[PDB]
Amino acid sequence: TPDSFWYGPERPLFLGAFTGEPPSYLTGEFPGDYGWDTAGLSADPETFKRYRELELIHARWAMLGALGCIFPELLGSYGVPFGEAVWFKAGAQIFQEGGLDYLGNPNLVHAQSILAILGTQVLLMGAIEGYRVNGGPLGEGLDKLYPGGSFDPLGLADDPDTFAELKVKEIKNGRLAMFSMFGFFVQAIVTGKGPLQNLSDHLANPGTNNAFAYATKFTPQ
Amino acid sequence: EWYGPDRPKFLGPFSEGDTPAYLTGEFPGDYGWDTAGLSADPETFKRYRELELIHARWAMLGALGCITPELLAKNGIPFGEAVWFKAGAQIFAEGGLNYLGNENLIHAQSIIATLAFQVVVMGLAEAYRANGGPLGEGLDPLHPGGAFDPLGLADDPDTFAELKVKEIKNGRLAMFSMFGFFVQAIVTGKGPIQNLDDHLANPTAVNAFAYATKFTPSA
């Protein structure tokens, strides 16, 4: 590990000063090491490699997901005629009369059958999720998490000082997006509105439109 | 085949690059699928095979016990309820839980009697499975044999290794079908054969996507 401020023994940790010594297997080697393994789930150094390559895939899907859930509701507020601009209602666009219009435009994609969407997706995802495991057209023998090559066309991973720095930015943007996509899940279950609607409802009155408005909502009887 | 590196993996050609190194192919049903890494400790992996197989065997008695009162009510045998997830309510009925329909049968009345029977009964048998006792002591907890192989099929380990694979793959289908049965009962509310029949009525319209808008939140 270099003197990169995010690595090694004197690295920032998840309780700041109150964290004490981190676990002995969290040596500040891999990015986003804030020393948070209080459950001890990654004490095995082979499971810890699997959980690293499972966190980052979760992170890269949730970074696409959090951008993908704000963007049709942000444009939907600005007059773009989506069928359902809200993200958790965006699946049911295939079941309405005109079908599913990308950008609310009838002569864009115009999906009508959900079985054609899923049948295309299973064939296309299954091809490329397997390419992530081994081989593939864009790269055959590469890293499991940071393959580069065709997946780094701009060359932004050439300097390994810069590359070890950007891996910290990737995991912190990812952990923020996973923590926020979990916020999208819970505050759509609890409230029932879109996350940009929950934001603008909170901004209109933060004293009453916080989460304690729905605190008695799941009360039994 | 089915053991060693000749075994077929869980991604087919895509898993030729990366299976976990500890999943060598010395256990039945090993297709090299530990992408989460939950079994790199071989003591934990010895514990998980016991959990998988007991879940598999209870799901095989489960998926047959959920499919048989529906296939016999279709023949015309009168049941209190054919579907499996409403099949506990018959002890709160008028005549109680008759077995098929007769009164010289079981005729369950008290739920406290039939549960406290089961608790002490399965308290003995499951503790015997974890330790050993009146049907074997030093036997294998995975596959005991002897009094648990009466028909003489746990012999000739070239065909007994294959019966181990036939054991878990029938079970892994059944566990996937009990979690099958669990979800399709919650999402639809009808029986699995009742879900089988109306998928055969119109397969394009009546499928899982017809209930996709059900659990939506709206307050």
Binding site: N105, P106, N107, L108 | -
Partner: protein
């Protein structure tokens, strides 16, 4: 029969009535003096005889025929499936954008911007190569079945199949050009 051809080439025949690909000699004339401050300005002399593009001409037939094979195969089936003449496309696509009867959302102004970026930049990258056999026959993604591991430099023939079909597709589209305005 010509002598400056017929080897390491698909169309090994001397068809040329005029020898357009003939390597000709050149002689370099000097620059005429144009300084007014001199008393006399001469008309320049013979300086350098030079001994001397079949590689350039091979590339340029291949591009025209491959655009023609996209044109001839593309005009017969758009006349078949849609039911409109190949000359009429553009008059009916300015009014309503379509492909095989399916309406498209694009204004005709956007098609200029789409085509000069997409087709233009791909044309800017084809001439970014400095090897005339790689310019005629590139590798990479354009040979997904990997037929460049084969050979055609011997009597075994594994290449002269596009170029004969490139020839009459240029002619059949030339036959489309003599048919469009006139007949």
């Amino acid at each position: 029969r010509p002598e400056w051809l017929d080897g390491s080439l698909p169309g090994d025949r001397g068809f040329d009535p005029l020898g357009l690909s003939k390597p000709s000699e050149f002689v370099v004339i000097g620059v005429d003096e144009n300084d007014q401050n001199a008393a006399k300005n001469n008309k320049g002399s013979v300086e350098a005889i030079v001994q001397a593009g079949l590689a350039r001409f091979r590339e340029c037939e291949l591009i025209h025929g491959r655009w023609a094979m996209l044109a001839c195969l593309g005009a017969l089936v758009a006349e078949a499936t849609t039911g409109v003449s190949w000359v009429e496309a553009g008059k009916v696509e300015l009014d309503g954008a379509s492909y095989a009867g399916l309406s498209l959302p694009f204004s005709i102004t956007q098609l200029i911007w789409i085509e000069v970026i997409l087709v233009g930049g791909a044309e800017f990258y084809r001439n970014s190569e400095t090897n005339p056999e790689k310019r005629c026959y590139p590798g990479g993604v354009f040979d997904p079945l990997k037929l460049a591991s084969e050979d055609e430099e011997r009597a075994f023939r594994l290449k002269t199949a596009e170029i004969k079909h490139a020839r009459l597709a240029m002619v059949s589209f030339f036959g489309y050009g003599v048919q469009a305005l006139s007949t």
